[PDB]
Write an enzyme that holds these catalytic residues in place. Structure first.
Site, PDB file in Angstrom:
ATOM      1  N   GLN A   1      -5.578   4.989   2.548  1.00  0.00           N
ATOM      2  CA  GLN A   1      -5.407   3.504   2.572  1.00  0.00           C
ATOM      3  C   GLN A   1      -5.887   2.890   1.255  1.00  0.00           C
ATOM      4  OE1 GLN A   1      -3.823   1.614   4.866  1.00  0.00           O
ATOM      5  NE2 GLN A   1      -4.207  -0.181   3.567  1.00  0.00           N
ATOM      6  N   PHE A   2      -5.184   1.857   0.797  1.00  0.00           N
ATOM      7  CA  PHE A   2      -5.521   1.178  -0.454  1.00  0.00           C
ATOM      8  C   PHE A   2      -6.657   0.184  -0.234  1.00  0.00           C
ATOM      9  CE2 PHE A   2      -4.631  -2.623  -3.227  1.00  0.00           C
ATOM     10  CZ  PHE A   2      -5.187  -2.086  -4.373  1.00  0.00           C
TER      11      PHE A   2
ATOM     12  N   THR B   1       0.851  -1.226   0.000  1.00  0.00           N
ATOM     13  CA  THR B   1       0.000   0.000   0.000  1.00  0.00           C
ATOM     14  C   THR B   1       0.868   1.251   0.000  1.00  0.00           C
ATOM     15  OG1 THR B   1      -1.874  -1.048   1.148  1.00  0.00           O
ATOM     16  CG2 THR B   1      -1.713   1.368   1.291  1.00  0.00           C
ATOM     17  N   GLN B   2       0.605   2.151  -0.945  1.00  0.00           N
ATOM     18  CA  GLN B   2       1.278   3.443  -0.986  1.00  0.00           C
ATOM     19  C   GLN B   2       0.266   4.529  -1.332  1.00  0.00           C
ATOM     20  OE1 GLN B   2       0.739   1.730  -3.656  1.00  0.00           O
ATOM     21  NE2 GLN B   2       2.580   1.391  -4.902  1.00  0.00           N
TER      22      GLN B   2
ATOM     23  N   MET C   1      -1.459  -6.606  -2.194  1.00  0.00           N
ATOM     24  CA  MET C   1      -1.694  -5.333  -1.499  1.00  0.00           C
ATOM     25  C   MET C   1      -0.570  -4.319  -1.734  1.00  0.00           C
ATOM     26  SD  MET C   1      -4.675  -5.497  -0.188  1.00  0.00           S
ATOM     27  CE  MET C   1      -4.771  -4.219   1.067  1.00  0.00           C
TER      28      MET C   1
END
Ligand SMILES: *C(=O)[C@]1([C@@H](O)C(C)C)NC(=O)[C@H](C)[C@@H]1O
Ligand SMILES: [Mg+2]
Lengths: 235, 233, 222, 240, 244, 250, 231, 212
Positions: free
Chosen positions: C1-2, B1-2, B107
């Site tokens: 957040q992804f 995640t970024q 992710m």
């Protein structure tokens, strides 16, 4: 010394060829396939009279529709049977159906050549795998430690194999009944066995579509032996 | 995640009778800062495919290197690398689509929206979309970001369904794309006047146009607008 | 957040006949308030007289269908080109879905075909693998609009026979393929009117002993 | 890790390492197992070359695997401890998961499986040990007696012996043991077990160990004086 | 490949013996004699240092007798370096047991553990066995005073009196002759030294060629004391028993 | 690749001999003579600097090595094996002791750790034993001064005085006659030089002889002042000049 | 002699005997023929039985809709290599939506067999394979040897007595290459070719095994009464 | 969800509802909440539907392997413990399960084990699991006796589900009945709650509050 997975100058794997010699020393096992069912029979060969012969388990159930008979170093067969049972049950779990006899045999034979320097040596045991499925009907397979398996109408393995196979050559035809096959296994077992054949030193079994795989009682087999004696004395 | 840092905005595209057109502006934004003004976001692969990328630029440059590496790898032990066994648009897309979905599944996504435009061996038009989620879809017109909201409506007036494709010429299609780019410059706050356009035709091949500008803009009416309601002067 | 999940909308519908089965689905693909495509096929022929659709998050839907098609291919290799029965396909799909129990395929899967007795079959799955054979199942965005209509018009629920007044139920007479297609079309026409994510086009895949046939119908594009 | 294939086939189809493991068993002190009608008895030889021994603490030849099953052996003493430990662990693991103690056949099958595994695993040699496993299944009064060997084969026996001069005591048991009517009582079974060892042992002093196992976890080891009384009675009847 | 150079340390001979174990025992037979004698009120450990020198610092030296814990000690016969590897493992097991159950480890449990480690080297791993034989002298509240021995095979047995190392055949005969069950520590001390004095390959048995130890309940009230004898104390007990 | 030698290269022969250890001791026998002598107030270790070539700078090759501030080592046999053992010995003195107890290990325990490393090369897979014998001299508060020998087998013995290598048999005899329990450090150095002269063929001076002592604390060699309890290293390597001064009174 | 104990050892003349012994296992195996035209590619295989009660060992394996092979030698090794091909064909389809080129399939088989000839512990594969396929550059036929050597050919044969069929194809080269748009005539030529390798025994209904792939023809195997037409 | 199972003279009665809900939405009225593990064992569905289907189908595979290896029917204790030990390994991961493993063997007799995704494993005579469990418990507790007939026991289980189906919003659809004997389970049909409610109301005189 020398490698375990070494090829001979003739183009054969030493260890596989040597394991075949161990199978020749093993007790006789015979299988006969018919349109009414497949019959499996074995020589128990107890090393002493004090040994309780009913504990000798050389015929084994894999699933309800697949049976198995062994010959050679029978201790080696336990992990093969375990894998076969697991493969049969696992396929039923994944696909909600019985597993094809060929597919089961193929799964067992995939273990065979997993040896090197995996296990340290090939299996020292041959298997007759008999069963039934809806696609190809009643089937009999011969699974070797080379990884190769042949389908057979009839097959004998063990010490009296070449003599028994020659007898199966003449006797087998495509219109054999189940009862005829039962007597034929008993006839050929009696011929190649050292000791005299009876219900305690020999065992029968079969696989049918209706009733599935069944090991024969000593009482049931005893009657078939008595029926055999009379029909041979009849001419 | 970024989070995406240096970003590229809309990529727009459409099919026409003999091929496909794709376009994207030359801006690399840094939030509200219009940081980099010379960024090429259309990346050709061979002479039959153009990959248009929006979103994170660092991830775009990574994808650019993967495609460059893909061409090299296809040439290895391949006598027909420039003929029958050359890279197709469908091959290039499926590869990217695999990567995008794999990366989202770990992710750790490539923060992009990608449009692969090209022409196949048999002359068929190829136009398909993929993004950071691995979501894919095809359509006579495709656009990313703001383009989806403003460009597609205009491009769909030209090619509303499949049967309108043979009726649409390259001149009409290019005109619609260029007009769409003007509209995006009027209304997208993260866009630039300078852009690149690529045409992939089954007859005339790949035509890559750099350093285009939005022109014929209407601003004169602004002089008459005064205040926010009641003010007259 | 992804956020690794998304909603591509769409609606699908499976109906099992006496000696046939249909699996229908609209061809619209969306995100939020935008249309991605007016024609993006959602129902797929997977071979062995099985049709499949995985509605919801299209990336997971495409991944699953791709993996099942792959499972059919390897079933042929491993088991002497044996035909994969619809019940066996259903169990196989459960294991594919449950394999990602703790990071699920965000889709509502439906497959359709014929069972080993030749009768019509439809199976319905949740995202994590729980499945069940059903006569009737709508899935996706407008599923809540369609299912009640199917309870009424397919299974004749709450319908009784005139004169008896609630004493005798309407008999469950069998529906022809022509009769089912009418109910499918009206279900999607109605769903299109009242659900914003449904429209553009309707694609129906019909499965019989003869094979898989396709039918396409226009839907409102607003 | 050490991966060398030590157990391998030879041209004549033999696995010499497994066969040489049997030769280690042949060297081991004699062990005998006899099952009666309602009991099983395990006899074991103690070589009298070792005196000045402390018999309190010296490892006993018969080992309890659980409260209802016992294991004796012939062959390498150190090797036997590894099999006994694994068996004891598996016995508790079975109780923990199946909520029922192991059957004698199951425990035998497990031990035999371990022995087999060492005949086709890399970097290991086979166990130089054959075992006699005896006991009673849970809630069952039928006696059980099984044998295992280095190869991994196992089987049930009415009576059996293993170790040095086992050929002689097996000869004795084959003529003296009747299947139609086995030793009806504990006394008769123990007597036949001591008799069979007296064919080989030398002196009947501290050289014979006897362990009687009965149904419902009733296991007891006989003392020197108790065994000595059997030795006295056997030879007094023999003088005739 | 590498197979060519493999000695195959963990195999059976045609006769059913473990080559390396047998050859390790042959090695141990050339080591200095160690004797353990168990009495009713204690245990004695006596051991002979091998052909020493006058310039060897004896008072700080330790090659034969080692302490495993406060209750258990060992006499070594074989490769000293190999023994120390095992000794440190044994010291740790005793402490692990003490940490777990909050009770001092029973002697047999410690002996079985070390013996099982030795066994492992004969069945797997392809490594040479430890060329060491131990005499374990120890006490616990279950069995009281105990003597054990273990050898490279991993086999261990219990003893009233026992010898390991050189001239065990001669030593074991002398012990079997003069040992009695009602014997006491002071008598056992005398027997141990007399046995070494006759079996020794040296011309005469002196204090500088010996290591000595006793495990006594001869400690103030119900408890056990280990006494590793000092050079001067070995010299005194040699005069007392009338050997020098 | 992979290290496929996972089996022992040192094994027992029928006679009970461990061949590779015996052969390692034979390599030590061929090695240059080194010795150690213990006095009441110190320890001395010494050896010959056998220069392989006169062009070689023998000062760069250190046969006598500091292991800790109060412990030193010297060897006979294969130099490269010695060098790596010194590296491992220095590191193990920190990892398995100083980083735990906040102080340097006593002589006997460091020796024990070195012995362990040498024992493992005698049993572990795919390795030969170390072809060296070490003489380790040292001091610690509770044990005082001490001298230890360590063989390829991993066995170690404490000595009042001893010698190893080429002329050890003759050298040990010479030490037996001269050694007593009332020796001062200077007397032990004098005896060390006499003993070492017998085994040396060619030149005998401060440049061809390497000699170090474990004696009094050297505050001048500490490198800092301000902490009373830190009084400096007891290990000191004698200079070329310091050796020659004592060779005049020889 | 002294240099055949394992695959890691060259002989003094620069030979790898373990590889050559593995090559010998192919010669012991039953004959199989491969040939192609511009439109189609055909495999013909003589199946071998253990005895009269036994079945005839299957020789042909399908790898994809457009590719498959015939085996000669250790059948389990063919199963391993064919399984590997199936995966590589399948990887190409799933990742690149691209049918695997027959030439590239040969390159992958070569490299897999090679690793087994240079490393200690393992062994060479004991089987030879004839891979046919139809890809974007038309029909193809490959010959795989477990030394690693893969060769693209118009026609070939491997197994016992394979030299007879190989000579026939060498004469017929100009004729059978021209058999375009006619699968039956191309199979006839393959059946006539494999017949040159027969002695004593002849082609029966459960003896013969044929497979074909082409322009509008998926890889399909013919056994039993399906090949009675060609006897 | 309403599922119950109770031990009695004639073996075990298992009774379940058929409704499946996602929030207020009724996803299905024809759900099978009894898994037929094998011809002698049954299991019930509460909480997670997939978790139940997947792991109790898996349980059936483990029970089949047991009787192949041991040549003997698996005990209810052993079968239940295989499942409870499995879910315990997954504890924390978010499995959702509440089941009664029901069976009838020689050595045990009729046995019911409540198994939980928290790792709980309880032997017992009466169990009710689900959102409508409290309603079923009321009818069971007041009417239960060990000496019930197979006919009356079957009705009690049917009536207890009906009680919950009526009051509990997340229970209903139809009632599935099973009767477990030593020779195996016996299915006693699917009973629509719509038709059953009116039938019971009239014949029993109950539900006087409701107008019919
Ligand atoms: C019952 O437990 C229930 C059913 O939907 C499934 C099909 C068993 N599970 C639930 O989560 C909801 C709340 C239902 O009660
Ligand atoms: Mg709409």
């Amino acid at each position: 010394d020398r490698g375990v997975s070494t090829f001979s100058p003739e183009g054969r794997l030493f260890q596989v060829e040597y394991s075949l010699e161990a199978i020749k020393l093993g007790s006789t096992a015979i299988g006969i396939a018919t349109k009414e069912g497949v019959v499996l029979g074995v020589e128990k060969r107890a090393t002493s009279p004090l040994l309780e012969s009913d504990s000798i388990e050389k015929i084994v159930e894999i699933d309800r529709h697949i049976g198995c008979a062994m010959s050679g170093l029978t201790a080696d067969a336990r992990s093969m049977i375990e894998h076969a049972r697991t493969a049969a049950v696992t396929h039923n779990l994944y696909y909600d159906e019985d597993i094809n006899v060929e597919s089961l045999t193929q799964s067992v034979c995939d273990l065979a050549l997993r040896f090197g320097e995996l296990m340290s040596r090939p299996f020292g045991v041959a298997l007759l795998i008999a069963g039934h499925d809806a696609d190809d009907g009643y089937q009999l397979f011969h699974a070797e430690p080379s990884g190769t398996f042949y389908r057979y109408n009839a097959k004998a393995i063990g010490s009296g194999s070449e003599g028994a196979q020659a007898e199966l050559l003449n006797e087998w035809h495509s219109s054999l009944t189940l009862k005829e096959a039962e007597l034929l296994v008993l006839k050929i077992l009696k011929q190649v066995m050292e000791e005299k054949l009876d219900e305690n030193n020999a065992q029968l079994s079969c696989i049918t579509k209706q009733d599935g795989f069944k090991i024969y009682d000593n009482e049931k087999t005893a009657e078939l032996i008595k029926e055999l004696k009379e029909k041979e004395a009849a001419e | 995640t970024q989070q995406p840092i240096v970003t590229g905005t809309s990529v727009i595209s459409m099919k026409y009778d003999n091929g496909v057109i794709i376009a994207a502006d030359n801006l690399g934004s840094y939030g509200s800062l219009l940081r980099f003004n010379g960024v090429e976001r259309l990346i050709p692969v061979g002479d039959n495919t153009v990959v248009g990328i929006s979103g994170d630029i660092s991830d775009m440059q990574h994808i650019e290197r993967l495609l460059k590496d893909l061409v090299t790898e296809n040439a290895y032990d391949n006598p027909l690398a420039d003929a029958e066994e050359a890279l197709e648009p469908s091959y290039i897309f499926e590869y990217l689509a695999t990567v995008m979905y794999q990366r989202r599944s770990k992710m750790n996504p490539l923060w992009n929206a990608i449009i692969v435009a090209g022409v196949q061996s048999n002359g068929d038009q190829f136009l398909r979309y993929v993004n950071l989620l691995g979501v894919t879809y095809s359509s006579p017109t495709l656009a990313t970001g703001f383009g989806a909201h403003m460009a597609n409506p205009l491009l769909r007036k030209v090619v509303d369904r499949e049967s309108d494709i043979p009726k649409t010429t390259v001149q009409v299609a290019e005109e619609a794309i260029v007009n769409a780019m003007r509209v995006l410059y009027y209304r997208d706050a993260r866009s630039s006047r300078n852009f690149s356009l690529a045409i992939i035709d089954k007859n005339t091949g790949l035509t890559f146009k750099k350093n285009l500008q939005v022109e014929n803009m209407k601003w004169d009416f602004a002089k008459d607008i005064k205040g926010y309601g009641t003010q007259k002067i | 957040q992804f956020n690794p999940y998304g909603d591509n909308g769409g609606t699908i519908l499976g109906i099992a006949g006496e000696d046939f089965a249909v699996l229908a689905g609209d061809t619209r693909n969306i995100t939020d308030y935008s249309i991605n495509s007016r024609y993006e096929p959602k129902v797929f022929d997977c071979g062995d007289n099985i049709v499949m659709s995985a509605n919801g998050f299209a990336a997971d839907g495409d991944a699953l269908v791709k993996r099942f098609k792959n499972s059919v291919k390897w079933y042929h290799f491993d088991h002497n080109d044996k035909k994969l029965s619809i019940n066996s396909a259903a169990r196989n799909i459960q294991h594919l879905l449950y394999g990602k129990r703790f990071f699920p395929y965000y889709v509502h899967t439906i497959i359709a075909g014929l069972d080993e007795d030749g009768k019509g079959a439809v199976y319905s799955f949740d995202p994590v693998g729980s499945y069940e054979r059903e006569q009737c199942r709508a899935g996706g965005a407008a599923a809540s609009l369609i299912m009640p209509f199917l309870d009424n018009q397919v299974n004749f629920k709450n319908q009784y026979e005139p004169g008896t007044n609630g004493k005798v139920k309407k008999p469950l007479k069998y529906l022809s393929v022509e009769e089912v297609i009418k109910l499918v079309r009206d279900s999607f026409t109605s769903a299109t009117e009242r659900h914003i994510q449904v429209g553009d086009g309707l694609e129906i895949l019909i499965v019989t002993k003869d094979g898989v046939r396709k039918e396409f119908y226009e839907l409102k594009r607003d | 890790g050490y991966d060398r294939a030590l157990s391998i086939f030879s041209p004549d189809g033999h696995i010499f390492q497994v066969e040489y493991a049997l030769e280690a068993v042949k060297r081991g002190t004699c062990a005998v197992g006899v099952k009666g009608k309602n009991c099983v008895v395990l006899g074991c030889e103690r070589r009298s070359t070792l005196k000045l021994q402390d018999t309190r603490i010296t490892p006993s030849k018969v080992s309890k695997i659980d409260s209802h099953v016992v294991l004796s052996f012939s062959g390498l003493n150190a090797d036997s401890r590894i099999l006994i430990e694994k068996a004891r662990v598996e016995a508790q693991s079975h109780r923990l998961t199946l909520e029922d103690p192991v059957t004698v056949e199951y425990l035998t099958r497990y031990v035999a499986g371990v022995q087999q595994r060492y005949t086709q695993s890399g970097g290991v040699r086979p166990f130089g040990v054959s075992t006699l496993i005896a006991g009673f299944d849970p809630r069952d009064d039928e006696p059980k007696l099984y044998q295992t060997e280095p190869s991994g084969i196992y089987s049930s026996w009415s009576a059996q012996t293993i170790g040095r001069n086992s050929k002689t005591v097996r000869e004795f048991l084959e003529k003296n043991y009747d299947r139609k009517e086995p030793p009806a009582t504990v006394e008769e079974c123990v007597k036949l077990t001591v008799r069979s060892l007296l064919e080989v042992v030398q002196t009947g002093a501290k050289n014979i160990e006897i362990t009687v196992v009965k149904p419902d976890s009733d296991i007891v080891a006989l003392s020197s004086e108790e065994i000595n009384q059997y030795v006295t009675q056997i030879e007094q009847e023999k003088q005739e | 490949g590498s197979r060519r150079y493999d000695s195959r340390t963990t195999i059976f001979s045609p006769e059913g013996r473990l080559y390396q174990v047998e050859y390790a025992l042959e090695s141990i037979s050339h080591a200095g004699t160690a004797i353990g004698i168990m009495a009713s009120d204690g245990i004695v450990l006596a051991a002979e240092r091998k052909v020493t020198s006058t310039l060897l610092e004896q008072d700080t030296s330790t090659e034969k007798l080692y302490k495993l814990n406060d209750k258990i000690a060992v006499a070594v016969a074989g490769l000293t370096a190999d023994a120390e590897i095992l000794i440190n493992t044994a010291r740790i097991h005793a402490q692990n047991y003490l940490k777990t159950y909050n009770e001092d480890i029973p002697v047999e449990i410690l002996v079985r553990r070390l013996s099982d480690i030795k066994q492992g080297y004969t069945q797997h791993g392809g490594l040479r066995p430890f060329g060491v034989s131990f005499i374990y002298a120890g006490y616990d509240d279950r069995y009281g005073y105990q003597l054990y021995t273990s050898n490279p095979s991993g086999n261990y047995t219990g003893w009233k009196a026992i010898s390991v190392g050189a001239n065990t055949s001669a030593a074991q005969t002398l012990l079997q002759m003069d040992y009695k069950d009602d014997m006491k520590v002071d008598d056992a001390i005398e027997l141990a030294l007399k046995t070494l004095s006759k079996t020794t390959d040296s011309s005469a048995l002196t204090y500088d060629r010996l290591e000595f130890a006793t495990i006594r309940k001869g400690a103030n009230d119900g408890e056990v004391y280990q006494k590793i004898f000092k050079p001067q104390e070995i010299k005194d007990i040699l005069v007392k028993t009338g050997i020098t | 690749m992979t290290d496929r030698y996972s089996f022992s290269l040192t094994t027992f022969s029928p006679s009970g001999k461990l061949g590779q250890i015996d052969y390692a001791l034979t390599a030590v026998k061929q090695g240059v003579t080194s010795l150690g002598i213990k006095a009441t107030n110190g320890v001395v270790i010494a050896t010959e600097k056998k220069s392989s070539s006169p062009l070689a700078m023998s000062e760069t090759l250190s046969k006598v090595s500091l292991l800790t501030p109060d412990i030193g080592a010297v060897y006979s046999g294969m130099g490269p094996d010695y060098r790596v053992l010194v590296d491992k010995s220095r590191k193990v003195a920190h990892t398995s002791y100083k980083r735990i107890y906040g102080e340097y290990p006593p002589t006997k325990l460091l020796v024990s750790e070195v012995a362990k490393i040498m024992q493992e090369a005698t049993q572990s897979g795919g390795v030969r034993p170390f072809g060296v014998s070490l003489l380790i001299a040292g001091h610690d508060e509770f044990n005082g001064f001490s001298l230890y020998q360590v063989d390829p087998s991993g066995s170690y013995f404490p000595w009042k005085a001893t010698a190893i290598g080429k002329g050890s048999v003759a050298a040990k005899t010479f030490l037996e006659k001269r050694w007593n329990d009332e020796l001062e450090l200077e007397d032990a150095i004098h005896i060390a030089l006499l003993t070492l002269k017998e085994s040396v063929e060619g030149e005998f001076n401060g440049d061809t002889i390497e000699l170090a002592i474990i004696g009094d604390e050297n505050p001048d060699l500490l490198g800092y002042t301000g902490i009373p309890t830190d009084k400096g290293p007891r290990f000191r390597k004698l200079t070329s000049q310091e050796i020659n001064d004592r060779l005049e009174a020889l | 002699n002294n240099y055949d104990g394992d695959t890691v050892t060259f002989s003094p003349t620069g030979r790898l005997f373990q590889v050559e012994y593995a090559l010998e296992a192919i010669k012991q195996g039953s004959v199989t023929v491969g040939l192609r035209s511009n439109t189609h590619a055909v495999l013909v295989a003589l199946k071998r039985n253990a005895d009269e009660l036994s079945s005839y060992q299957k020789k042909i394996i399908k790898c994809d809709e457009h590719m498959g092979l015939s085996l000669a030698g250790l059948a389990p090794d063919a199963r391993v290599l064919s399984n590997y091909l199936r995966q590589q064909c399948n990887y190409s389809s799933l990742v690149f939506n691209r049918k695997l080129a027959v030439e590239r399939a040969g390159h992958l088989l070569c490299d897999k067999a090679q690793k087994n000839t240079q490393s200690y512990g393992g062994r060479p594969y004991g089987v030879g394979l004839l891979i046919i396929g139809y890809d974007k550059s038309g029909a193809h036929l490959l010959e795989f040897q477990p030394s690693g050597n893969v060769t693209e050919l118009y026609g070939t044969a491997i197994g016992a007595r394979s030299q007879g069929a190989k000579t026939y194809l060498e004469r017929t080269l100009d004729t059978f290459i021209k058999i375009d748009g006619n699968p039956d005539e191309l199979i006839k030529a393959g059946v006539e070719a494999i017949s040159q390798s027969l002695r004593d025994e002849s082609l029966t209904v459960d003896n013969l095994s044929i497979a074909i792939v082409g322009k509008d023809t998926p890889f399909t195997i013919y056994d039993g009464e399906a090949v009675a037409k060609y006897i | 969800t309403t599922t119950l199972a109770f031990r009695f003279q004639g073996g075990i009665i298992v009774a379940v509802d058929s409704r499946a809900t996602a929030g207020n939405w009724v996803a299905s009225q024809t759900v099978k909440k009894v898994i037929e593990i094998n011809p002698f064992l049954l299991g019930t569905m509460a909480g997670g539907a997939a978790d139940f289907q997947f792991w109790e189908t898996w349980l059936g595979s483990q029970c089949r392997l047991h009787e192949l290896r041991e040549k003997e029917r698996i005990s209810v204790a052993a079968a239940s413990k295989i499942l409870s030990n499995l879910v315990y390994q997954y504890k924390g991961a978010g499995l959702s399960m509440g089941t009664m493993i029901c069976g009838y063997t020689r050595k045990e007799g009729p046995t019911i084990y409540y198994v939980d995704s928290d790792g709980t494993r309880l032997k017992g005579d009466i169990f009710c699991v689900g959102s409508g469990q409290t309603f079923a418990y009321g009818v069971l507790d007041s009417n239960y006796k060990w000496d019930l007939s197979v006919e009356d026991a079957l009705y009690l289980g049917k009536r207890s589900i009906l009680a919950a189906a009526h009051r509990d919003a997340y229970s209903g659809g139809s009632v599935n009945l099973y009767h477990v004997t030593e020779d195996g389970w016996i299915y006693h049909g699917n009973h629509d709650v719509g038709e059953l409610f009116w039938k019971v109301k009239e014949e029993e005189g109950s539900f006087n509050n409701v107008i019919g």
